[PDB]
Amino acid sequence: FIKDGQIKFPDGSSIVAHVERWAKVRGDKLAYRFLDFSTERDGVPRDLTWAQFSARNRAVAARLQQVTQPGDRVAILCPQNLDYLVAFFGALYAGRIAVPLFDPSEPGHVGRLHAVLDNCHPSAILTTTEAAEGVRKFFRTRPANQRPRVIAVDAVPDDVASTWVNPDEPDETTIAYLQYTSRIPTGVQITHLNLATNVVQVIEALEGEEGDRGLSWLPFFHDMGLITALLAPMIGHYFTFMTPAAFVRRPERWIRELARKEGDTGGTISVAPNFAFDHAAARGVPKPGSPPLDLSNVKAVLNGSEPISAATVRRFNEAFGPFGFPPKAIKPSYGLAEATLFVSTTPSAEEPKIITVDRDQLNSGRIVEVDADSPKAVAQASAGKVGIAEWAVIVDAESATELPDGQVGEIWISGQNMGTGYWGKPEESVATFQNILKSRTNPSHAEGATDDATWVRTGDYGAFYDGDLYITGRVKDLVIIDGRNHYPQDLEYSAQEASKAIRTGYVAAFSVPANQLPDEDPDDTSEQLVIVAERAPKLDIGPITDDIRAAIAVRHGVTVRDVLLTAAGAIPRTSSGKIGRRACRAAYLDGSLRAGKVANDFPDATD
Numbered sequence: 271f272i273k274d275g276q277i278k279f280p281d282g283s284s285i286v287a288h289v290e291r292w293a294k295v296r297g298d299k300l301a302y303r304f305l306d307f308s309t310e311r312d313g314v315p316r317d318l319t320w321a322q323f324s325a326r327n328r329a330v331a332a333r334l335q336q337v338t339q340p341g342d343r344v345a346i347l348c349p350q351n352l353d354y355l356v357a358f359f360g361a362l363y364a365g366r367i368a369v370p371l372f373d374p375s376e377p378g379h380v381g382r383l384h385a386v387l388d389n390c391h392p393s394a395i396l397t398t399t400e401a402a403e404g405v406r407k408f409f410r411t412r413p414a415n416q417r418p419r420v421i422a423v424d425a426v427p428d429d430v431a432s433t434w435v436n437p438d439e440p441d442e443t444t445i446a447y448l449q450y451t452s453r454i455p456t457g458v459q460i461t462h463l464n465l466a467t468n469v470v471q472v473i474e475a476l477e478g479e480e481g482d483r484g485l486s487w488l489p490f491f492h493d494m495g496l497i498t499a500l501l502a503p504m505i506g507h508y509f510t511f512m513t514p515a516a517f518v519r520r521p522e523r524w525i526r527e528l529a530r531k532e533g534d535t536g537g538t539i540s541v542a543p544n545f546a547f548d549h550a551a552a553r554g555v556p557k558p559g560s561p562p563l564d565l566s567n568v569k570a571v572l573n574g575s576e577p578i579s580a581a582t583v584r585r586f587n588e589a590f591g592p593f594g595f596p597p598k599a600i601k602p603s604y605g606l607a608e609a610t611l612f613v614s615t616t617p618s619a620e621e622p623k624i625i626t627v628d629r630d631q632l633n634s635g636r637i638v639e640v641d642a643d644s645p646k647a648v649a650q651a652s653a654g655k656v657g658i659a660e661w662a663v664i665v666d667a668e669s670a671t672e673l674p675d676g677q678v679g680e681i682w683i684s685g686q687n688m689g690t691g692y693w694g695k696p697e698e699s700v701a702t703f704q705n706i707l708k709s710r711t712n713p714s715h716a717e718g719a720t721d722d723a724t725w726v727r728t729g730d731y732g733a734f735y736d737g738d739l740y741i742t743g744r745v746k747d748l749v750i751i752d753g754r755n756h757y758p759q760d761l762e763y764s765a766q767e768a769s770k771a772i773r774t775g776y777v778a779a780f781s782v783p784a785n786q787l788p789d790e791d792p793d794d795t796s797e798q799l800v801i802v803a804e805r806a807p808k809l810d811i812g813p814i815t816d817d818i819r820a821a822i823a824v825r826h827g828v829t830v831r832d833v834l835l836t837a838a839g840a841i842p843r844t845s846s847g848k849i850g851r852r853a854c855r856a857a858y859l860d861g862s863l864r865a866g867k868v869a870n871d872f873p874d875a876t877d
């Protein structure tokens with residue numbers, strides 16, 4: 271669609287009308303393929319053509335229109351499979367607000383599911399026949415008046431579709447679905463306009479052509495897995511997916527989906543968080559004597575949702591370069607739920623941009639390049655260029671003032687893809703989404719946005735440098751000790767490089783007040799460094815601790831006051847698998863981390 275400063279639609283912005291059209295001209299073509307690895311090690315493909323997809327969406331939608339009213343929320347408590355997509359699109363087809371969640375009988379934070387439900391109060395629950403009893407059982411733990419009707423989407427017959435009524439065309443405020451992140455849970459209001467805008471933004475950035483195909487193992491309950499699933503079939507080829515557990519168990523599965531197949535006229539496109547690249551590199555290489563592996567066909571594998579490590583990038587290429595994997599296929603990318611999904615990515619024709627900058631300058635808020643062999647060198651991966659019809663600026667948050675390039679400040683963003691608020695929360699909505707950019711530089715990274723445009727504060731620090739956006743970390747994760755700043759991922763890299771006994775990527779650095787440290791001055795409240803590190807899957811703690819302490823002291827000039835070593839799987843991670851530093855700190859302070867009793871729901875390599 272055309273651009274006039276912003277993205278214009280009419281013919282419509284409804285994904286419903288667009289899928290229905292796309293469906294009538296490619297009826298027999300495949301739309302989705304689910305690789306089910308639950309009973310068979312090599313997988314069993316479950317296919318869905320466009321005509322079947324449409325038929326099911328219309329049937330589920332008609333059923334929803336009989337038992338829910340316009341404006342009601344419809345929660346999806348379903349495992350990762352074809353039915354999850356049918357349930358989600360069914361909600362959109364019905365003109366009801368979907369709430370993509372997960373199957374309560376699978377791993378999950380049960381207290382958060384209760385909190386989410388306490389905020390969105392759905393009028394219906396969409397699940398499958400297999401998951402239904404488990405869903406009901408969960409609702410028997412909720413109050414008697416909060417047990418909405420449970421619909422098994424695979425049991426709604428196709429003929430129920432005859433009564434389906436295409437909902438009223440959406441305006442710019444009409445909410446399509448709520449995206450819960452990540453306690454207290456905030457549901458981002460994603461409008462049909464938001465969704466269609468980000469879809470167009472992503473398609474422009476990916477430069478997908480006839481024959482390219484998309485694939486993913488990412489969970490549908492997270493923005494990166496959901497949005498990818500909704501838009502991948504739109505590039506012209508069916509979308510293939512598997513579960514996260516399936517990937518974690520045998521990462522080679524992802525690698526072989528990416529690889530060239532007979533019949534491929536284009537390349538493959540996927541997306542994953544940074545830790546997944548390391549898991550694939552260490553455990554996803556074919557064993558000698560396996561069928562040939564040709565990865566020279568990969569077009570783009572986006573690396574986003576968490577900090578990109580230059581070492582992870584190097585390890586991925588070292589493992590898969592010998593199989594033809596082109597290094598320019600790795601595309602560091604940035605985004606967040608409040609922006610639907612996509613904010614920036616490395617241009618299609620370019621290789622990842624990775625620079626080595628001065629540590630001290632970085633810690634004091636400035637990007638200054640240095641030689642890679644310098645002892646003060648910190649490697650920073652770029653997140654590329656901001657997408658079309660959206661803007662990102664770097665600001666001094668308190669004065670809402672843009673900063674010149676090379677200076678670090680909070681990243682604020684704007685665009686038609688920004689969510690319209692958080693469900694039921696006016697104060698939080700204003701604070702996060704309705705910020706005003708009071709002062710701009712010349713040139714301004716806000717050029718093209720109106721002076722009264724609203725800005726979302728991302729909670730991230732970053733900077734522009736030589737035409738690329740760099741994400742340095744979350745504001746709330748910064749380590750401030752004795753008047754100096756330290757990025758926790760830089761301290762973590764030093765800790766793991768100091769000892770082979772630490773699992774790569776499973777380290778968390780944060781500060782706690784002096785008085786919260788263990789017994790090994792009760793009025794001292796100054797922030798002190800703590801390193802939590804998982805042990806590689808037993809060597810005594812003394813030598814390891816001293817290696818960590820000594821390496822951090824020499825290059826960062828800060829003394830670790832406590833090094834806590836845990837078993838693999840002990841550090842808290844979000845539901846999409848990101849190391850959660852604030853959560854690790856809270857577990858350190860509330861007694862659960864030291865007692866070795868932290869609950870994690872994302873599948874772990876060991877268990």
Ligand SMILES: Nc1ncnc2c1ncn2[C@@H]1O[C@H](COS(=O)(=O)NC(=O)CCCCCCCCCCOc2ccccc2)[C@@H](O)[C@H]1O
Nearest residue numbers: 484498502539540541574575576577603604605606607741
């Ligand atoms: N690059 C980065 N570096 C450091 N931190 C990053 C980060 N990206 C996100 N984060 C951190 O994650 C936070 C947001 O978390 S979140 O709400 O859970 N949301 C997220 O994590 C969303 C991240 C989205 C990243 C952009 C990915 C766009 C993928 C399009 C692929 O399309 C396809 C794929 C296949 C076929 C066809 C098309 C952010 O606020 C930031 O703190």
